[PDB]
Design an enzyme around this catalytic site. Sequence first.
Site, PDB file in Angstrom:
ATOM      1  N   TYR A   1      -1.376  -6.351   3.944  1.00  0.00           N
ATOM      2  CA  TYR A   1      -1.625  -6.577   3.652  1.00  0.00           C
ATOM      3  C   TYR A   1      -0.871  -8.623   3.042  1.00  0.00           C
ATOM      4  CZ  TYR A   1      -4.305  -2.683   1.694  1.00  0.00           C
ATOM      5  OH  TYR A   1      -3.966  -1.095   2.171  1.00  0.00           O
TER       6      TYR A   1
ATOM      7  N   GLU B   1      -2.122   4.797   0.769  1.00  0.00           N
ATOM      8  CA  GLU B   1      -1.944   5.435   2.007  1.00  0.00           C
ATOM      9  C   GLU B   1      -1.035   5.594   2.173  1.00  0.00           C
ATOM     10  OE1 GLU B   1      -3.278   0.798   3.003  1.00  0.00           O
ATOM     11  OE2 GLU B   1      -5.695   1.160   2.402  1.00  0.00           O
TER      12      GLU B   1
HETATM   13  C1  HEM Z   1      -7.312  -5.176  -1.248  1.00  0.00           C
HETATM   14  C2  HEM Z   1      -7.418  -5.621   0.305  1.00  0.00           C
HETATM   15  C3  HEM Z   1      -8.334  -5.230   0.094  1.00  0.00           C
HETATM   16  C4  HEM Z   1      -9.649  -4.524   0.808  1.00  0.00           C
HETATM   17  C5  HEM Z   1     -10.101  -5.206  -0.787  1.00  0.00           C
HETATM   18  C6  HEM Z   1     -10.410  -4.378   1.601  1.00  0.00           C
HETATM   19  C7  HEM Z   1     -11.837  -3.641   1.963  1.00  0.00           C
HETATM   20  C8  HEM Z   1     -12.263  -2.891   2.615  1.00  0.00           C
HETATM   21  C9  HEM Z   1     -13.479  -2.129   2.832  1.00  0.00           C
HETATM   22  C10 HEM Z   1     -14.359  -1.928   1.515  1.00  0.00           C
HETATM   23  C11 HEM Z   1     -13.814  -1.481   3.998  1.00  0.00           C
HETATM   24  C12 HEM Z   1     -14.366  -0.548   4.183  1.00  0.00           C
HETATM   25  C13 HEM Z   1     -14.731   0.490   3.482  1.00  0.00           C
HETATM   26  C14 HEM Z   1     -15.498   1.554   4.040  1.00  0.00           C
HETATM   27  O1  HEM Z   1     -15.709   1.393   5.273  1.00  0.00           O
HETATM   28  O2  HEM Z   1     -17.012   2.017   3.567  1.00  0.00           O
HETATM   29  C15 HEM Z   1     -12.153  -1.623   4.449  1.00  0.00           C
HETATM   30  C16 HEM Z   1     -12.127  -0.938   5.791  1.00  0.00           C
HETATM   31  C17 HEM Z   1     -11.208  -1.776   7.227  1.00  0.00           C
HETATM   32  N1  HEM Z   1     -10.428  -2.792   6.043  1.00  0.00           N
HETATM   33 FE1  HEM Z   1      -9.936  -3.178   4.310  1.00  0.00          FE
HETATM   34  N2  HEM Z   1      -9.297  -4.258   2.921  1.00  0.00           N
HETATM   35  C18 HEM Z   1      -8.481  -5.071   2.288  1.00  0.00           C
HETATM   36  C19 HEM Z   1      -6.630  -4.491   3.014  1.00  0.00           C
HETATM   37  C20 HEM Z   1      -7.530  -4.714   4.350  1.00  0.00           C
HETATM   38  C21 HEM Z   1      -5.826  -5.212   5.761  1.00  0.00           C
HETATM   39  C22 HEM Z   1      -4.975  -5.615   4.635  1.00  0.00           C
HETATM   40  C23 HEM Z   1      -6.520  -4.624   6.814  1.00  0.00           C
HETATM   41  C24 HEM Z   1      -4.986  -4.842   7.901  1.00  0.00           C
HETATM   42  C25 HEM Z   1      -5.870  -5.440   9.095  1.00  0.00           C
HETATM   43  C26 HEM Z   1      -7.346  -4.392   6.760  1.00  0.00           C
HETATM   44  C27 HEM Z   1      -8.150  -3.994   7.500  1.00  0.00           C
HETATM   45  C28 HEM Z   1      -9.697  -2.965   7.709  1.00  0.00           C
HETATM   46  C29 HEM Z   1     -10.230  -2.442   8.740  1.00  0.00           C
HETATM   47  C30 HEM Z   1      -9.456  -2.225   9.966  1.00  0.00           C
HETATM   48  C31 HEM Z   1     -11.385  -1.311   8.518  1.00  0.00           C
HETATM   49  C32 HEM Z   1     -12.523  -0.355   8.699  1.00  0.00           C
HETATM   50  C33 HEM Z   1     -11.420   0.644   9.095  1.00  0.00           C
HETATM   51  C34 HEM Z   1     -12.754   1.698   9.458  1.00  0.00           C
HETATM   52  O3  HEM Z   1     -13.874   1.679   9.596  1.00  0.00           O
HETATM   53  O4  HEM Z   1     -12.389   2.758  10.134  1.00  0.00           O
HETATM   54  N3  HEM Z   1      -8.040  -4.121   5.372  1.00  0.00           N
HETATM   55  N4  HEM Z   1     -11.827  -2.433   3.898  1.00  0.00           N
END
Ligand code: HEM
Lengths: 145, 142
Positions: free
Chosen positions: B91, B133
């Site tokens: 994060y 998580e």
């Molecule tokens: C406040 C912080 C964050 C927000 C608002 C955010 C937002 C989101 C959203 C909206 C999605 C897609 C949800 C869906 O699949 O419908 C997502 C997925 C994802 N996020 Fe973030 N995220 C955050 C933090 C992080 C961090 C720190 C990482 C580190 C690399 C990350 C990596 C990913 C990855 C790899 C996915 C794809 C997961 C999948 O498709 O199975 N995210 N995030």
Amino acid sequence: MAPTLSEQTRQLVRASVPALQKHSVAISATMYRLLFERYPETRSLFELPERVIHKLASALLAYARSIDNPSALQAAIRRMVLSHARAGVQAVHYPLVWECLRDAIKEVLGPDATETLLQAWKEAYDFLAHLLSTKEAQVYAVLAE
Amino acid sequence: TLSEQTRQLVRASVPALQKHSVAISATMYRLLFERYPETRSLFELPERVIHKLASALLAYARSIDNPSALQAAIRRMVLSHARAGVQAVHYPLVWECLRDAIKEVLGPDATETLLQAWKEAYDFLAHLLSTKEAQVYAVLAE
Ligand code: HEM
Ligand code: HEM
Ligand SMILES: [Cu+2]
Ligand SMILES: [Cu+2]
């Protein structure tokens, strides 16, 4: 977490690996089409139906290749659990997907889909289903609070 | 909880996000790709996630005054992060990239009091996500 994998189930599931190497995509795609047309409530669950079809085809192959050691699929089981929980898959859906998977095997393998082979895959399915559905219920309960 | 000043600044950001959230989310992904290559493993569908984060930023700002309208979206975020293997230590990395994307897209509007408000707003959401998580991670161990 009760159900088990008998010696005959493992032997017959192991033996279908050559057929799955050639037909697991046909089985997975046919399975999803039967699910699309028999239980329309479930189509709302699939964002990327083409992509999931090839993922399930690989999982079937990997699961059959590792039916003697299911714990070697821990990472993939984790992915299935969280994907299902993300989409809202429910405990009562699992009988429906088995129904469609049984008939997908009957259709694709034709004569080689003997009733013993179908019973082996039913047991291998019921094992994987019981593990997936119980871990999903736990994940649901944690995100409710 | 979030101070009145940062909530007024998040509210004031909604016009920028309704026009530029995609640009902010895409720039933030391109920066994360180049600065932390270990994270590329985590993204299966980068193009699709860029648009999903853009919509989540916009929705977050539009309901900054009651994050409970995001309950379904938070659930989706938590389960996608778990499914990908996102960790609490990730994060801070994505914040630095989001801040620099805001700086780049908002330009002169990206003053330090605006960026401070978004740091607070991000930290609130990151805390909510990462603790859920961890709870999910603990149950997967059983
Ligand atoms: C406040 C912080 C964050 C927000 C608002 C955010 C937002 C989101 C959203 C909206 C999605 C897609 C949800 C869906 O699949 O419908 C997502 C997925 C994802 N996020 Fe973030 N995220 C955050 C933090 C992080 C961090 C720190 C990482 C580190 C690399 C990350 C990596 C990913 C990855 C790899 C996915 C794809 C997961 C999948 O498709 O199975 N995210 N995030
Ligand atoms: C033993 C039974 C089952 C097996 C082996 C299985 C296997 C899989 C696999 C491998 C994936 C892809 C996970 C990934 O890598 O992202 C998946 C996703 C999915 N499955 Fe199944 N599945 C089973 C039962 C079910 C049931 C009962 C349903 C009910 C409709 C279902 C619907 C879905 C959906 C909607 C997704 C995509 C969810 C997402 O990616 O967010 N599956 N399944
Ligand atoms: Cu295909
Ligand atoms: Cu785009």
